[PDB]
């Protein structure tokens, strides 16, 4: 289970670099919860 | 008086049909009140439907996950039941040909499946070491017949007291109060696992079988009647006829037909066994007559149903039943 | 339903587990290894000690294992009765185990299944079922 | 002489094991597919409305036969358009 | 045309991809999908395009592969998705597919 | 409920030889008991089934 | 208690008069219908 | 019929028919079904 | 004629004389009373093509191929290979 | 050792040969092919050859069906039959004895011994294995 998570390290960056177009209302008809200690908003869960 | 009593015809059977169909051991048969089709709960997890007359397929009612152990058609309702080594108990509606009800409650592989005659009620039993009595309609267990201490490997059901007859690895038998959920008698005269019961059509009597003395009993008290003696194998089946003929098939293929008045067995047969099979293969887990009392239908470990029909000519001259005689001992 | 759990707690250990796909292969066996515990008990006469009941099984299994491998399974003096017991209750297994490698190679041909597990298992079961029958095609070429 | 592996039939015909007066039935495929019940359900085929019993109506029924049988009161026609 | 085989043959070269990679990189999955699908359209070139049967895999299977990625970011399944993310070239942070 | 329980060797003795037996009855009782019993059982199950539905 | 233990099929289905009532089986002579069916299958 | 004269073999597949396909077998591994199932899903 | 590993491709051409002989000779070796030769010629192989383009089944055409298959099958010994009806499909181009 | 590479439609046996034998075999493979084409052993019609890839084959075989003399004339009872076939099980049916003799022709008697010998082998997978006398094995570098 660790080696699976470790092969998906490079994968994590990819999310960052497209975060602005991924994390929006039109892509996820989700519950918009504000992330804590910040002014940002996560629309999905998108844990990566 | 004991030796005097024991001194006190019926024609020979033959192979008529080999229905090669299933792909695992047939562990069950039930023939349908109208005498036109019968069922064979195989270990392909498939109930199949055969024609008495032609011996042809009809249905393949799939819906189990492990050897369909029991089966039972009810006459009063157009239902068919089944059981297995799944804990599953089903109600196959015959008009639609699908399942309607599950009867959940059994903790492990169920073997016995038999339908009370009056009261809409269903009795099943297995290795939970208990016979469960189910309520047809509201799919809800009424009774836990708690007593035996092992696999309740057989059941039989009647209208009058002793309405419920168990039989187990305990090498015992109880007779049951369906109202109270407690045992009347406690009949221990077997020495090993009771792999059969069966009620006589009219007589008011029930033969209990096994790999020991194929015993044979009375009622309410049950008090012993006699021993059919001569079967040297492990016997699974005690099928009774209307014209006082038993049939006992064993795990060798040894098929001895008996006579209910005396005790004398008048026939013995090997099972012969299908082409690809092994020699050990031969066996007989289940078998029964028609409602007429004219046919014998079997369930062999050859992965096959075979049908035995009496010969046409008959007559003591053109048959010769085996010899009866008197001697000492007890 | 949740309140009753909160002012009672869960009932006695049992209820009923209701099979499912995860626990079918296990519960199949459990029954077979208690329908041989039956048939022995009755095959053994009326006083020959019960130190075999459990003992018979470790053959059964080894027999089964032996089949899958295709190695023969001669065994030094054991009762010709109990040789057959075990040749018979193996033959059963070897159906419901072949059967399935049929039935799942035709839920893959089609598309239905996924998750390696099943496409991994029913690739094994074939690879045996096929080696079994590339063995016979050799033996029955030097003999024939 | 040479029996090629394809043919090499190991076991004996299902007949010659009994092979005479016994019926050897090989039954793989079903007949009468699932849809067909098995215990036929009663089914009253009805096309059109009809009244179980006569509906009661002002003029008595004998008087309708009186007219129909007795006299030239009766007419008949076709309503069309 | 494309025979009935080479349709279902290709329809599996993809199912193979989605088993092997139980847990791998997004960059690599794309990289298998591009070899698969160049090798399909560089052999059957003229025919490939001329059948309907192939060209309603090539849609559904391209979607199967996106839906792999699509899932490994989030479970609730995007109503739509931005197509730049998939088709934009690698040198701008794309998969290249 | 122990009056049917066995005790003597007599109990292993067949009914054809008990010695002290008038007649052996093999007939299957009657209809007016059949309908008494069926009433007794069916009333009993119903009082139980009702009380099961109450707790369920 | 669960989902599966809810009210369902509160009605049983007793045998209608044509499809196989137990009384019609008594008047039926099973014996002769059996033999005649075997002869037909055999002849074909 | 000079083309059929040159063939170094002759009516080989001459009596190719019948087979035990009718004969049911109680041996799942040595049926015909199974011989087709392994015929198809391999090579 | 060409062989690609385990696949064989052949191109025949017949005059009415030879076509007559070949069909007759095959038909004589194995008679055709029932006329089931048209039933199992195709196994739904060319159903991808339209019904227009699909090969038509005349009594003459069917028997031509069926026979060519039978003729060629015999030229190989049954101990080195076989041929098979399912794994083959000869297309008959004629007047029809 | 023998291992099955799955495709969900039809399996494939795959042959794990030892590392040194492969270097030898691979040399051999390359050798016969270089030398056979240096002296034109093979005809034209044996065709997965170095000239055409498979789609150009199809073109060049439709280009040939038009460049026969008077192909499309169905005037006076002419008839074309174009047949395509699969030799069911050629790789199973092959023997080594016959192969050994046939082989002995094409090359030196010492090389041909290698090939024939190479094919015998033991096949292995998990609990089981067997010899391979009858069949022809493809894993070899020169099995083409």
UniProtKB/Swiss-Prot annotation, chain B:
One GO cellular component term: Prp19 complex
The WD repeat ranges on this chain: 21-51, 63-93, 105-135, 147-177, 189-218, 230-259, 279-309
Localisation: Nucleus
Keywords: mRNA processing, mRNA splicing, Nucleus, Repeat, Spliceosome, WD repeat
Broad class of where this protein is predominantly found: nucleus
Parts of the chain that traverse the membrane: none
A biological process from GO: mRNA splicing, via spliceosome
Domain of life: Eukaryota
Family: Belongs to the WD repeat PRL1/PRL2 family.
Quaternary structure and interacting proteins, as annotated: Belongs to the 40S cdc5-associated complex (or cwf complex), a spliceosome sub-complex reminiscent of a late-stage spliceosome composed of the U2, U5 and U6 snRNAs and at least brr2, cdc5, cwf2/prp3, cwf3/syf1, cwf4/syf3, cwf5/ecm2, spp42/cwf6, cwf7/spf27, cwf8, cwf9, cwf10, cwf11, cwf12, prp45/cwf13, cwf14, cwf15, cwf16, cwf17, cwf18, cwf19, cwf20, cwf21, cwf22, cwf23, cwf24, cwf25, cwf26, cyp7/cwf27, cwf28, cwf29/ist3, lea1, msl1, prp5/cwf1, prp10, prp12/sap130, prp17, prp22, sap61, sap62, sap114, sap145, slu7, smb1, smd1, smd3, smf1, smg1 and syf2.
Chain's role: Required for both cell cycle progression at G2/M and pre-mRNA splicing. Interacts genetically with the PRP4 kinase.
Designated name of the protein: Pre-mRNA-splicing factor prp5
Organism: Schizosaccharomyces pombe (strain 972 / ATCC 24843)
Upper taxonomic lineage: Eukaryota, Fungi, Dikarya, Ascomycota, Taphrinomycotina
Swiss-Prot record, chain G:
Subcellular location(s) of the protein: Nucleus
Top-rank lineage group of the source organism: Eukaryota
Function: Involved in pre-mRNA splicing.
UniProt record similarity statement: Belongs to the CWC15 family.
Subunit comment: Belongs to the 40S cdc5-associated complex (or cwf complex), a spliceosome sub-complex reminiscent of a late-stage spliceosome composed of the U2, U5 and U6 snRNAs and at least brr2, cdc5, cwf2/prp3, cwf3/syf1, cwf4/syf3, cwf5/ecm2, spp42/cwf6, cwf7/spf27, cwf8, cwf9, cwf10, cwf11, cwf12, prp45/cwf13, cwf14, cwf15, cwf16, cwf17, cwf18, cwf19, cwf20, cwf21, cwf22, cwf23, cwf24, cwf25, cwf26, cyp7/cwf27, cwf28, cwf29/ist3, lea1, msl1, prp5/cwf1, prp10, prp12/sap130, prp17, prp22, sap61, sap62, sap114, sap145, slu7, smb1, smd1, smd3, smf1, smg1 and syf2.
Name of protein: Pre-mRNA-splicing factor cwf15
Protein's organism: Schizosaccharomyces pombe (strain 972 / ATCC 24843)
Gene name tied to this protein: cwf15
Parent-protein start and end of this portion: 24 to 67 of 265
Swiss-Prot record, chain H:
Locations listed in the record: Nucleus
Source organism, top-level taxon: Eukaryota
Family that this chain belongs to: Belongs to the CWC15 family.
Biological role stated in the UniProt entry: Involved in pre-mRNA splicing.
Complexes and interactors: Belongs to the 40S cdc5-associated complex (or cwf complex), a spliceosome sub-complex reminiscent of a late-stage spliceosome composed of the U2, U5 and U6 snRNAs and at least brr2, cdc5, cwf2/prp3, cwf3/syf1, cwf4/syf3, cwf5/ecm2, spp42/cwf6, cwf7/spf27, cwf8, cwf9, cwf10, cwf11, cwf12, prp45/cwf13, cwf14, cwf15, cwf16, cwf17, cwf18, cwf19, cwf20, cwf21, cwf22, cwf23, cwf24, cwf25, cwf26, cyp7/cwf27, cwf28, cwf29/ist3, lea1, msl1, prp5/cwf1, prp10, prp12/sap130, prp17, prp22, sap61, sap62, sap114, sap145, slu7, smb1, smd1, smd3, smf1, smg1 and syf2.
Protein's recorded name: Pre-mRNA-splicing factor cwf15
Source organism of this protein record: Schizosaccharomyces pombe (strain 972 / ATCC 24843) (Fission yeast)
Gene: cwf15
Range within the parent protein: 223 to 265 of 265
UniProtKB/Swiss-Prot annotation, chain J:
Subunit structure: Belongs to the 40S cdc5-associated complex (or cwf complex), a spliceosome sub-complex reminiscent of a late-stage spliceosome composed of the U2, U5 and U6 snRNAs and at least brr2, cdc5, cwf2/prp3, cwf3/syf1, cwf4/syf3, cwf5/ecm2, spp42/cwf6, cwf7/spf27, cwf8, cwf9, cwf10, cwf11, cwf12, prp45/cwf13, cwf14, cwf15, cwf16, cwf17, cwf18, cwf19, cwf20, cwf21, cwf22, cwf23, cwf24, cwf25, cwf26, cyp7/cwf27, cwf28, cwf29/ist3, lea1, msl1, prp5/cwf1, prp10, prp12/sap130, prp17, prp22, sap61, sap62, sap114, sap145, slu7, smb1, smd1, smd3, smf1, smg1 and syf2. Interacts with prp1.
Gene: spp42
Listed name of the protein: Pre-mRNA-splicing factor spp42
Localization annotation: Nucleus
Superkingdom, natural source: Eukaryota
Function (record text): Involved in pre-mRNA splicing. May be involved in endoplasmic reticulum-associated protein degradation (ERAD) and required for growth at low and high temperatures. Required for pre-spliceosome formation, which is the first step of pre-mRNA splicing. This protein is associated with snRNP U5. Has a role in branch site-3' splice site selection. Associates with the branch site-3' splice 3'-exon region.
